[PDB]
Amino acid sequence: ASVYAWNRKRISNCVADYSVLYNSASFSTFKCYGVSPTKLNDLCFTNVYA
Amino acid sequence: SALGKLQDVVNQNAQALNTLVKQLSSNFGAISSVLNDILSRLDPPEAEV
């Protein structure tokens, strides 16, 4: 999507493996706010908005 | 209400303890009042703040 009309994919009721995204080489920016990127796999959230 | 002098002392101490304990639920500007949630979510550079 264009930024003015950005897409939102609500993510729920699933197992979120965040080590795949963080340890990937394909990403240049990976900045986390409010949580640390290396503790993501130990956390649970009610809902994720992608 | 005859023994109010003693009951008032008991009530004041009970209120003081309840107030002190309830202060642990305050954020004081932090992201969470629960210390375990902060340590579970953040690394030391942000957790210390």
The residue type at A15: V
The answer to whether residue A39 neighbours chain B at the CB level (below 8 Å) is yes
Question: Given an 8 Å threshold on Cβ–Cβ distance, is B46 in contact with A42?
Answer: no
Decide if A18 contacts A40 (C-beta within 8 A): yes
Give the C-alpha distances (Å, rounded to integers) separating B19 from A39, B2, B10, B22, B26.
34, 27, 14, 5, 11
Helices (H) then strands (E): counts for chain A = 1, 2
Residue of A22, A32, A36, A40 to mutate for B, most B C-beta atoms under 10 A: A36
Judged by CB atoms closer than 8 Å, whether chains meet at B42 and A36 is answered as yes
Resolution, expressed in angstroms to one decimal: 2.2
Method: cryo-EM
Give the position of tokens 């009530």: B11
Write out the two tokens for A4. Answer: 């003015």
B48: region left, alpha or beta (phi > 0 left; psi from -120 to 50 alpha) = alpha
Cβ contact (<8 Å) for B42 and A38?
no
User: What is the three-class DSSP state of A28?
Assistant: coil
Contact A48, A11 (CB under 8 A): yes
